[PDB]
Amino acid sequence: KPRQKRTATKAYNVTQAFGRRGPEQTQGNFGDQELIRQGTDYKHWPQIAQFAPSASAFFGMSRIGMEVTPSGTWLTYTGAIKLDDKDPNFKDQVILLNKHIDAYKTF
Amino acid sequence: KPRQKRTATKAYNVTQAFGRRGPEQTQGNFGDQELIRQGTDYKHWPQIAQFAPSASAFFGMSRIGMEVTPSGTWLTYTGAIKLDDKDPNFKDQVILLNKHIDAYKTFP
C-alpha cells in the first residue's frame, strides 16, 4: 500500500509501516513504545484518531506544497488542529498527547 | 463537527467548512474555484483524496507538536507524502495538484 494509506496494527506495527521514530524532517515523531507496537490496536487509539483529519479536512485545512527534493517528488503539508477546551475529555487528551509526542527521546 | 472531521460538499463548501484560502501560516491554500465550491462533490475528488493520509498514517508519518497560545491548545502537524514518479498517471497527478495549490491567488 502507499505509505499514506497504511494502517498500523500489532501484526504490522508503526515501525514496520512508517519507519522508526525520529527528529528528521522526513520522520514521524509520535508514539511511545506501546502505541508503536500496537498501532490502531493501542488501548487509547480512538482518542488519538479523533484528531486525525478527514480527506476533505486534510486538503481544506493544510498548507499544501509540491517539492522536488534529492529523493524525488513530494506533496508537503502543514497545519494546526485546535483542541476543544469545552470537551470534558480535554485534560486527558492533553495528557495522552504529551505521552506520545517525541516519546522516542526516552527509549 | 470538529473542524478536522468535516467533509466539504456543495451544500457546505470548502470556505464554509475550512475558511477562505490564503497565504497565512495556518490558513489553507489548496483549491481552485471549482473545488472550493464543490468539496468532495468535485468530479476528480478521488484523484486528490488518494494522497490523503489514513488516521494511522497521519500520526505515523507526521511531525506532531502541541502549542498553547491565547487562542487555545493546538496540535501542530507537518509532513510530506511521496508521489510515485513511476506511476503512468504521475504527470496527471502533478497537473491536478498544481491546479489547486495556491490557486486562490488568481481570483478574489
Side-chain angles (χ1 to χ4, degrees), chain A residues 1-9 11-19 21-23 27-32 34-84 87-98 100-107, chain B residues 2-19 21-24 26-42 44-85 87-108:
Chain A
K1 285 196 128 201
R3 189 172 183 242
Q4 71 272 20
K5 299 304 190 176
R6 294 172 189 165
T7 291
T9 63
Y12 182 57
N13 63 38
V14 168
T15 311
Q16 307 177 262
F18 308 116
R21 255 83 283 278
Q27 230 158 2
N29 70 330
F30 187 93
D32 72 8
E34 192 173 358
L35 169 58
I36 286 168
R37 134 170 52 90
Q38 302 245 58
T40 63
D41 300 313
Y42 174 66
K43 57 188 215 285
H44 305 308
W45 176 252
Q47 287 67 46
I48 294 166
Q50 74 187 312
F51 299 113
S54 70
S56 183
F58 179 75
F59 282 100
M61 298 184 317
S62 309
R63 293 203 64 76
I64 303 298
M66 189 164 265
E67 283 185 11
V68 180
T69 74
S71 59
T73 303
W74 297 82
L75 189 71
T76 62
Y77 59 92
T78 69
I81 294 159
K82 199 185 223 166
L83 275 67
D84 182 2
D87 187 334
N89 295 312
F90 173 87
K91 284 182 175 0
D92 284 57
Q93 294 158 9
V94 165
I95 285 148
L96 179 56
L97 291 169
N98 277 343
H100 295 288
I101 291 168
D102 287 333
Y104 74 92
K105 295 183 167 169
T106 68
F107 33 97
Chain B
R3 198 172 174 246
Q4 69 267 20
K5 301 297 189 186
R6 295 173 185 168
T7 289
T9 59
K10 299 156 152 30
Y12 184 50
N13 64 32
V14 172
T15 298
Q16 303 173 295
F18 307 117
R21 270 71 280 284
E24 302 303 325
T26 53
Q27 183 175 26
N29 71 331
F30 189 90
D32 70 7
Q33 300 200 85
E34 188 183 10
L35 174 52
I36 286 168
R37 71 180 158 84
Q38 291 174 339
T40 62
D41 293 323
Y42 184 63
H44 287 83
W45 180 249
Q47 285 71 46
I48 298 176
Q50 74 183 303
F51 299 111
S54 67
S56 180
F58 181 78
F59 278 100
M61 303 181 311
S62 310
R63 313 206 42 75
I64 304 292
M66 185 187 270
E67 278 168 28
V68 182
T69 84
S71 59
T73 299
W74 297 78
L75 197 64
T76 63
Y77 60 94
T78 68
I81 291 149
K82 199 163 201 292
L83 272 81
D84 185 1
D85 52 88
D87 193 328
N89 306 330
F90 172 74
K91 161 187 213 224
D92 288 339
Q93 295 164 0
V94 167
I95 287 160
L96 173 58
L97 288 163
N98 276 341
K99 201 204 313 188
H100 297 286
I101 294 166
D102 287 340
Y104 76 90
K105 293 179 178 183
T106 68
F107 49 87

